[PDB]
Each structure stands twice: as C-alpha cells, then as structure tokens.
Amino acid sequence: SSSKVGVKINEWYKYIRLFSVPDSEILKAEVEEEIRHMKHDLLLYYSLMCFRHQLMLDYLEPKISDLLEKIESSQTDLKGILEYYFNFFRGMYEFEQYEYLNAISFYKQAERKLSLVADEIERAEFHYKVAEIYYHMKQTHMSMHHIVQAIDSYKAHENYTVRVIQCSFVIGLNYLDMDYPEKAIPHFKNALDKAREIDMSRLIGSSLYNLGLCSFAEEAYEKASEYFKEGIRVYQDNGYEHSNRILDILLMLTKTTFKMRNHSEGISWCAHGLSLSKNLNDEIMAKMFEFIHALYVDNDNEKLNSILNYLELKSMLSDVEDLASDAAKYYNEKEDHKVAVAYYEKVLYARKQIQ
Amino acid sequence: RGHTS
C-alpha cells in the first residue's frame, strides 16, 4: 500500500500549509507507523515532509541538519514532483539561513517543474515564497508579479488566513519600497486586524513593525517608535523572546530613538540589540547594529565601509542601501558634506547593483 | 527589511 501512504503524505502537506498543528502531528504519527512495515524513494518524500513539518514548527515556536542529511543522502535520479518538493524545500531552508544566492537557485529549479504542480494552493505557496525572497532582494516588480498570483489563489480558498496575512505583508512592503507608505498602510492594517482574529501573536507584532516602517518613511518618528515598542512588547510577551526577527524591530527602534535626538535611549536600545543579537548567534543582524553604533556614536567610517562590504558579499544590497542612506543623511545634517557625498554615492551604487 | 513573516 505504497500509494495509501503517499496519499497520507499529501494530506500531511495540506495540513502543514493550513498551519493546523494537531492534524500535522496526527498524520506524522500515522505515516511513521506505516513506514515501519512498508515496501521506494517514498522514504525521501517522508523525509521531505519531516523537513517541511519542521519549518512549520520552527515558525510557530522557535537538529534540522540531521533532516538535511537524510534529504541530501541518496538523491540520485530525481524526477517528477518529488524533485520539485526537493528544490522548493531546500530553497526555503536556504532562505532561512540568509543564503539568498542558493535559495534563489533552488527556487528557480523548482520553477522549471511548476507545470507538474496541479494544486492551485501549492502553486500559491511557491509564488508567495518566491515573492518573499524577491522583496528581500528588492526585485520589486518580480515580487509583485508573484505575490498577486499567490494571494489570488489563497483568497479564493478558505482557512489560509495566515498565508494571506503574509501576502499582505509582501504587497504593502513593495508599495513601501516604491515610496508609497500611504498605499502600504491599508494592507498592513488589514493584516493586523486579521492577525488579532486568529490571535497570532507573531503576526500581530510583525504587523506593528511594518506599520512602524510606514511611520518611519513619513518621518513620524514618535508613531514609529510606538509601533516598534508595542511590537517588541508583543514579541517578548508571547514566547518570542529569542526569535531572530525581533532584532529587525529593535534595530528600527534604535534608528528611530536616535533620529529623535534622544541619544541616551538610543544608546540603551543599540546595546539591547547588540547583546541579544550575539545571544541568538546572528552575525548579520549583529553587524547591522554595529553600523548604527559606529555611525551614531563615534562616527567610525572605516567600520561603516567594512560593514557595508560585508553586507554586499552576503548579497544583501538592500540593507547596504538602507545603511548608506542613514549615514549619508546623518553626515549631511552635520554639515559634513564630504563624507555625506561618499555615502550618497554608495546609495547610488547599491541601487544600480539591485538592477 | 520588513517582516514578510
């Protein structure tokens, strides 16, 4: 009965995409009881699903390399939709490890076999993960192309509220990347209301963070700090004290408190973020708190350029542009127009690289 | 970047 268990793996995937944890645990136990007395590469499909299941668990509540060992072991002569799941899931994992070059390579290999995918929901999953990594790479038009396909499929179906809220995140954030904050606030707000409907604390705090990015773009720095403070509260009050994404909120608050000329609170916030970033062992976010410190405290420019180059070798030209924007503006306000020239030039370089 | 969750 190899088809009966592969069918149950399909249902396991369906409950994974629906973010139904009890159903996912039920079908994990059912399938695992079948694997013992079973006749293929089905063991890879099972392992592939154990991998995807783990990514859902990690997202809900913060090793995996053992599952990567069973995935990377004996992948000889792949074909069909199993090859699609292979490249797609490996791309999701590479995206979670700040490996953008590899995640894009895997996503494109999963895209070649997309006609093998019959479920509109599964294609919506692919389109959303591709639009996500395209927003992070600031390929705004490509990200919009994929995100509208994904959200149309999700909204056509029911109970995919979590994935629709994330699609609202991507849509609004691309509008924000086009200097349209008032066009991005409706989507972030809509996602916030639906985030408190399913009582998804992580999504609520992320909605507060994106809305604060809108107030930051409009230079309403107090309202931005309000969103950042309440997002930090929501994260560190609901079991998300050690989730890496909370650093993105602390970091923005560090800029905002620093921009409001509150040097002391900014000193403390940059310290909170640098310490927690070292604790969670995230070198990327750590060097980004190092930039804000070297810029807003002791004006260390060689350190700024060392960090900007580091961030470029990680293919994170978006964060390179954001930080060079911070430095060029800060030095321009201090009448230091020579070094302000240098960092505005780096913003131009990053924008051209993104193309 | 922003949270694409």
Numbering used by the authors:
A (entry chain A): 7 to 45, 48 to 70, 79 to 371
B (entry chain C): 1 to 5
Task: Show me the paper's own sentences about this structure.
Proteins of the RRNPPA family are the most frequent pheromone receptors in Bacillota and use small secreted oligopeptides as pheromones. While most members of the RRNPPA family act as transcriptional factors through DNA binding, Rap receptors are specialized members that exhibit the capability to develop their function by interaction with specific protein targets. Binding of the pheromone produced from the propeptide, which is named Phr in this RRNPPA subfamily, induces Rap receptor inhibition. Our results reveal that distinct maturation processes generate multiple mature pheromones, which bind to receptors with varying affinities but produce identical structural and biological responses.
In addition to the 2 putative pheromones RRGHTA and SRGHTS, we included in the analysis an extended (RRGHTAS) and a shorter (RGHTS) version of the internal and C-terminal putative pheromones, respectively, that could represent alternative forms of their maturation. Rap3T shows 4 times lower affinity (EC50 20,75 nM) for the putative Phr3T C-terminal canonical pheromone (SRGHTS) and more than 10 times lower affinity (EC50 69,75 nM) for the possible maturation variant of this peptide with one less amino acid. To molecularly assess the differences in affinity and stabilization for the alternative peptides analyzed we solved the structures for Rap3T in complex with RRGHTAS, SRGHTS, and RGHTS. Meanwhile complexes with RRGHTAS and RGHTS peptides exhibited P21 space group and a Rap dimer in the asymmetric unit. Remarkably, these structures exhibited nearly identical conformations as confirmed by the low differences in the superimposition of their Cα atoms for either individual monomers or the complete dimers (RMSD 0.36–0.50), dispelling the notion of peptides eliciting divergent conformational shifts. Comparison of complexes with RRGHTA and SRGHTS peptides showed that the sidechain of Arg in position 1 for RRGHTA mediates a network of salt-bridges with D264 and D335 plus hydrophobic interactions with M304 meanwhile the Ser in this position for SRGHTS only makes a hydrogen bound with Y225. These differences in interactions for position 1 may explain the lower stabilization seen in thermal shift assays and the higher EC50 value from thermophoresis assays for SRGHTS. Accordingly, the complex with the shorter peptide (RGHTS) showed that this position is empty, explaining why this peptide shows the lowest affinity for the receptor.
